[PDB]
C-alpha cells in the first residue's frame, strides 16, 4: 500500500443520474478507478485521502465501445467503477 | 539573407510590387506584411460564441522570395549578408556594407 | 542410432542394379551388435555397441587403450 499506488488508485468521480441519486439518498459515492485496483486498495485509498469510514466497496467493469469515425474503426478503453458506501452520514 | 519579424521590407514581385510595410509574422517560406495583400473573408455567423459574421478584410501571406529588405539610406531594395564585427554576427547590406538599421 | 562406438561406421546409401540395369535406392548397414568386455582396471563389465571390425581393433590394441581413446573423445563409457 505504497503512497504512489494510493495516489494512482482513484481517477475521478462519476456524473450521472444514477450516481447522483445514490449519493443523495444512500450515502454512496461512485468513482472511476484504475483497471487493476482491488477492493482493499480502493478502501484504503479512500480512507487515507478523504478521511471517512468505508463500509463496503462494489466494483464493475464496462468494456469500451467500438465506433467508426471517418474511414477508420477505433475502440475506447475499458472503465472500472467503484460504489463506495459510507458509514452513517458522511460526505 | 534572413528576414525577421520587425523588418521594413518592400515587395518586389506580384500584384503589390512596389509597396512597403512592416513584417507581421514569418512562418516557413511565407511572410505577412502590414496593410498589403488584403483579402475579403465571408465569415459565417458563429452559433456558440455569437459574434455574427460578415465581410471582413485581412492580410494574406506572400512567398518570402517576393519581398526584399528596404535600405533606409537610399529607399531601394537590397540583399542581406552577414559580417562578424566584434564577436557578434550581424546582418549587413550587400550594396553598401552598412549594418541593417534595427527598427 | 546405428553408429559404431569404436570406428564410427554408419549406414550408407547405394543402388540395387538389376540385370536390365534398373536402379533403385538401397542402404548398406554395418555389422553392429552389443558386447560386454571385462575392464580389469575398474573391475567391471563395460557394454559397447560396435562392429566386428571394432572387435578386431580391440584384439589388436587391448581394451584399456581403446577405452582411454574413447574417453578422450568425450564418450561416456
Amino acid at each position: 500500500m505504497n503512497n504512489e499506488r494510493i495516489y494512482q488508485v482513484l481517477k475521478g468521480p462519476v456524473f450521472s443520474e444514477k450516481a447522483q441519486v445514490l449519493g443523495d439518498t444512500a450515502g454512496v459515492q461512485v468513482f472511476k478507478v484504475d483497471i487493476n485496483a482491488t477492493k482493499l486498495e480502493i478502501k484504503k485509498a479512500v480512507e487515507k485521502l478523504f478521511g471517512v469510514e468505508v463500509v463496503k466497496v462494489n466494483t464493475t467493469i464496462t468494456k469500451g465501445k467500438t465506433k467508426r469515425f471517418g474511414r477508420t474503426l477505433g475502440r475506447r478503453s475499458d472503465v472500472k467503477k467503484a460504489y463506495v458506501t459510507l458509514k452513517a452520514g458522511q460526505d | 539573407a534572413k528576414i525577421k519579424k520587425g523588418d521594413q521590407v518592400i515587395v518586389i514581385a506580384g500584384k503589390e510590387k512596389g509597396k512597403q510595410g512592416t513584417v507581421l509574422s514569418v512562418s516557413e517560406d511565407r511572410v505577412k506584411v502590414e496593410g498589403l495583400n488584403l483579402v475579403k473573408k465571408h465569415q459565417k455567423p458563429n452559433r456558440v460564441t455569437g459574434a455574427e459574421g460578415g465581410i471582413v478584410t485581412q492580410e494574406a501571406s506572400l512567398h518570402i522570395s517576393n519581398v526584399a529588405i528596404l535600405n533606409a539610406t537610399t529607399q531601394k531594395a537590397d540583399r542581406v549578408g552577414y559580417q562578424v564585427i566584434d564577436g557578434v554576427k550581424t546582418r549587413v547590406y550587400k550594396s553598401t556594407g552598412e549594418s541593417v538599421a534595427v527598427a | 542410432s546405428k553408429v559404431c562406438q569404436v570406428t564410427g561406421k554408419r549406414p550408407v546409401v547405394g543402388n540395387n542394379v538389376s540385370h536390365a540395369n534398373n536402379k533403385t535406392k538401397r542402404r548398406f548397414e554395418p555389422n553392429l551388435h552389443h558386447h560386454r568386455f571385462w575392464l580389469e582396471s575398474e573391475k567391471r563389465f563395460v557394454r559397447l555397441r560396435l562392429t566386428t571390425k571394432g572387435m578386431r581393433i580391440i584384439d589388436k590394441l587391448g581394451i584399456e587403450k581403446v577405452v582411454a581413446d574413447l574417453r578422450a573423445q568425450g564418450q561416456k563409457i
Binding site: 504512489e4 482513484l10 481517477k11 468521480p13 | - | -
Partner: protein, 60 residues
C-alpha cells in the same frame, strides 16, 4: 528549476517527491470535478516528478 532541485539534498528531494505526488493527485481530482481553468499546472507537476526521479537516480 532543475538547478534548484540539484542544489537540494536527498532527504529534501524524497520529501518533495511525495509532496508533488499529492499535489498531482489533488490537481487531477480538481480537474475531474471541473473547477479548474488552467491545465498547464498538471503538466508542470508531471514533469517535476520526472525531474526529481532523474536527479534521485543520478545522486544515488
Amino acid at each position: 528549476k532543475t538547478k534548484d532541485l540539484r542544489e537540494k539534498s536527498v532527504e529534501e528531494l524524497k520529501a518533495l517527491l511525495d509532496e508533488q505526488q499529492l499535489n498531482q493527485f489533488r490537481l487531477r481530482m480538481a480537474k475531474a470535478t471541473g473547477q479548474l481553468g488552467k491545465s498547464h499546472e498538471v503538466q508542470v507537476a508531471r514533469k517535476t516528478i520526472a525531474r526529481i526521479k532523474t536527479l534521485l537516480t543520478e545522486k544515488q
